Amino acid sequence: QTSAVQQKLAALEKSSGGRLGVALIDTADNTQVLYRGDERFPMCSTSKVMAAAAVLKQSETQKQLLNQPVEIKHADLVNYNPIAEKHVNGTMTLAELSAAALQYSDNTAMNKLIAQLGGPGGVTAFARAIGDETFRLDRTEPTLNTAIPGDPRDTTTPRAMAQTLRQLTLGHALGETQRAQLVTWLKGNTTGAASIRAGLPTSWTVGDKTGSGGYGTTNDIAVIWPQGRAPLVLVTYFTQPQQNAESRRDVLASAARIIAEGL
Numbered sequence: 001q002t003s004a005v006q007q008k009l010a011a012l013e014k015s016s017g018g019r020l021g022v023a024l025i026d027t028a029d030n031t032q033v034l035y036r037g038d039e040r041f042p043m044c045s046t047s048k049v050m051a052a053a054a055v056l057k058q059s060e061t062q063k064q065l066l067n068q069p070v071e072i073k074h075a076d077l078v079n080y081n082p083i084a085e086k087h088v089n090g091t092m093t094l095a096e097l098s099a100a101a102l103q104y105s106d107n108t109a110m111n112k113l114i115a116q117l118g119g120p121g122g123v124t125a126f127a128r129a130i131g132d133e134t135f136r137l138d139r140t141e142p143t144l145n146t147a148i149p150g151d152p153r154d155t156t157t158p159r160a161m162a163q164t165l166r167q168l169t170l171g172h173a174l175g176e177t178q179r180a181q182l183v184t185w186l187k188g189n190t191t192g193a194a195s196i197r198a199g200l201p202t203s204w205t206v207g208d209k210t211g212s213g214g215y216g217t218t219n220d221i222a223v224i225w226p227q228g229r230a231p232l233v234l235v236t237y238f239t240q241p242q243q244n245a246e247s248r249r250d251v252l253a254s255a256a257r258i259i260a261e262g263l
């Protein structure tokens, strides 16, 4: 069956020229609305949520882990290091690296999270441990953002990422204090006002993590607290046919608006 909401998302996708993937979970009734929900998309920086969460899980058995210093050397700097560049020849704690990765989308900070987990496969291993059989991280920053059509590396599906984001932020994949810390970090994101939240009522509260990369790939994953009802989880992934395509955060806002209108 195709619902009215799915038909509107297909019309938005058709006008956009690209490929749109959407997964909503409404935690009031556990119902799901999906558009291309089982197709693979490049995660780009939305993968930073999984890496931060994996470190949070490690911190459950090490009370001081988030205060552990990590050396930042000039050679560690990659292509977008707004926080880490200030600490070259110094250190940042794992909490500082997590906050920088999630809230500023710092790629050097992400690489330190990946390294703390033993490489991209350590992130994938954590995803499996929390029941996500779909997520895969294959590369470090910045190459995990190439976003080549048909390439399986560094991809997931909207359905899997929505289920994972729910378990991490509203369920029990993490301990109570770690879940609260992840929610606090997401709610303080600086990069998200033009993406999912631009399509939602202003009274709603959002925590999100954006991503972008090659092929005009433009992504956002969010936990949403509407006024007066149970939280929602929403994934919006978008990717385009030409390598140099421009980003389209407005398409993510439009997808979120259609979803909100259908509730």
Ligand SMILES: O=C(Nc1cccc(-c2nnn[nH]2)c1)c1cc(-n2cccn2)cc(C(F)(F)F)c1
Binding pocket: 079, 080, 104, 105, 191, 210, 211, 212, 218, 247, 248, 249
């Ligand atoms: O910094 C970025 N992208 C980047 C960085 C370094 C190299 C290249 C590159 N390599 N080749 N071509 N461009 C690209 C970047 C982009 C976006 N964004 C643009 C449109 C929609 N979202 C948002 C953010 C932020 F959320 F973090 F603020 C960072």
Ligand SMILES: O=C(Nc1cccc(-c2nnn[nH]2)c1)c1cc(-n2cccn2)cc(C(F)(F)F)c1
Binding pocket: 045, 079, 080, 105, 106, 107, 142, 143, 144, 145, 146, 147, 191, 210, 211, 212, 213, 214, 215, 216, 243, 244
């Ligand atoms: O690293 C990147 N982008 C980035 C960096 C930091 C934050 C964010 C972000 N966060 N939230 N939204 N965007 C995005 C990035 C981008 C591109 N590219 C090519 C055309 C358009 N883009 C290519 C590459 C790669 F060639 F190395 F693969 C990396």
